[PDB]
């Protein structure tokens, strides 16, 4: 037995979201989760589940549930899926093919845009190789793009790896800030600790 209601508000209604390259993860355990306050909320532009059906989610029990949250522009939310390619999927957040979980996104223009463009939200534009699934890279080492070594951006063929989104509230919807939460359901050959209601 266990009585706690899982703290999804901590992750969803959070004030500051992570830059996609340095994405955040929260462990959700020893609590009970009513998923109906998620797929029945009219707040989300995207709610796409894999290996599970969202309707039939309150009937299962998991060892742990992990929530990865970050921000990208809307035209890139399609990359947050198994087998996707592109800047975000290749250099920032790659989901595996065998992925089991739900991917949730919603417009955060009222929250993440400047007048003038929000430069705090960043994404990786250069990397020597693609990420493994669920791999993370918060390095800011200057990107060598020629045969010549690098010190700072001022060097030739020395690019700064990160790029700013510059979120303005006047952008097209495809350039607008979209907050993304990705749930992975981890069921191990260990006692389950996060269950649906009843």
């Amino acid at each position, epitope marked *: 037995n266990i009585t706690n209601l899982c703290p999804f508000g901590e992750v969803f209604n959070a004030t500051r979201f992570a830059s996609v390259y340095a994405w955040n993860r929260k462990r959700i355990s020893n609590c009970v989760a009513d998923y109906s306050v998620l797929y029945n909320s009219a707040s989300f532009s995207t709610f796409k589940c894999y290996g599970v059906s969202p309707t039939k989610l309150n009937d299962l029990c998991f060892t742990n549930v992990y929530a990865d949250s970050f921000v990208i522009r809307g035209d890139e939310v399609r990359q947050i899926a198994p087998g996707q390619t592109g800047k975000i999927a290749d250099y920032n957040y790659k989901l595996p093919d065998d992925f089991t979980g739900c991917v949730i996104a919603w417009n955060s223009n009222n929250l993440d845009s400047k007048v003038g463009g929000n430069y705090n939200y960043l994404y990786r534009l250069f990397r020597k190789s693609n990420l*493994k699934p669920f*791999e993370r890279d918060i390095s800011t080492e200057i990107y060598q793009a020629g045969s010549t070594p690098c010190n700072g951006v001022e060097g030739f063929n020395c690019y700064f790896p990160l790029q700013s989104y510059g979120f303005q509230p006047t952008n097209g919807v495809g350039y607008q800030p979209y907050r993304v939460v990705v749930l992975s359901f981890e069921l191990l050959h260990a006692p389950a600790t996060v269950c649906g209601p009843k």
Partner: antibody, heavy 111, light 108 residues
Framework: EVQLVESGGGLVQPGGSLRLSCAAS????????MSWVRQAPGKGLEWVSL????????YYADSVKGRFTISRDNSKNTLYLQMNSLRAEDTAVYYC????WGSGFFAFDVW | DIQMTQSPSSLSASVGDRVTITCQAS??????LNWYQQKPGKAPKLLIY???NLETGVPSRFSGSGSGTDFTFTISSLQPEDIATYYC?????????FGQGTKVEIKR
């Protein structure tokens, strides 16, 4: 239970070489980023290097670039640190540390 | 490099006292700051990850708080088995860096 056991520490001449070994047991080694963290005697802590689970991505502190090399054989559940051009300042106790989630650059949960 | 500064360098408190250590970051690093304990001749102890999340199997008297630049680590009731050096570590960028450490002692 999760276990990390380090080995290879000894006395070397300045400029000498040395290969540290960290034997891992109790978890799926191949799915966690691992890191090396050293401590000079009576000093604080200093992150040294990090390797991703597959081993494809490696990161170093500037103070050890080009001298040290992190590596792993997911077959033997072993993490390695190859240290060349050692200096008096590298004198420290060396720990291997597991990433809290395994993705990389999270808290070090096991030492 | 993000330079983490700990205050105090060392403190002594009576058994059962409430004890508070702060880590001061040289920039706003959000909640990217973990806390470690190291007892003499032993390896570090992951105590608090992110800014306030208490690791599995850690006494409830330990709790973290803060965000931005000032982070607090709190012992609600200091116990003799808490004699160790406590380290904060930043999680926002490479190189990952630690505070210089804070040495806790018992005033008796």
């Amino acid at each position: 239970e999760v276990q990390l056991v380090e080995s290879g520490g000894g006395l070397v001449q300045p400029g000498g070489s040395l290969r540290l070994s960290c034997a891992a047991s109790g978890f799926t080694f191949s799915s966690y980023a691992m890191s090396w963290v050293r401590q000079a005697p009576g000093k604080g802590l200093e992150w040294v290097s990090l390797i991703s689970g597959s081993g494809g991505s490696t990161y170093y502190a500037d103070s050890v670039k080009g001298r040290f090399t992190i590596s792993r054989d997911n077959s033997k559940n072993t993490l390695y640190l190859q240290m060349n051009s050692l200096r008096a300042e590298d004198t420290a106790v060396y720990y291997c540390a597991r990433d809290l989630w395994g993705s990389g650059f999270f808290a070090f949960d096991v030492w | 490099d993000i330079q983490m500064t700990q205050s105090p360098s060392s403190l002594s408190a009576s058994v059962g006292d409430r004890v508070t250590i702060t880590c001061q970051a040289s920039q706003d690093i959000s909640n990217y700051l973990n806390w470690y304990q190291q007892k003499p001749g032993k390896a570090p102890k992951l105590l608090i990850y992110d800014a306030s999340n208490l690791e599995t199997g850690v006494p409830s008297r330990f709790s973290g708080s803060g965000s931005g630049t000032d982070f607090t680590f709190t012992i609600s009731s200091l116990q003799p088995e808490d004699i160790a050096t406590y380290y904060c570590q930043q999680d926002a960028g490479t190189p990952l860096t630690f505070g210089q450490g804070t040495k806790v002692e018992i005033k008796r």
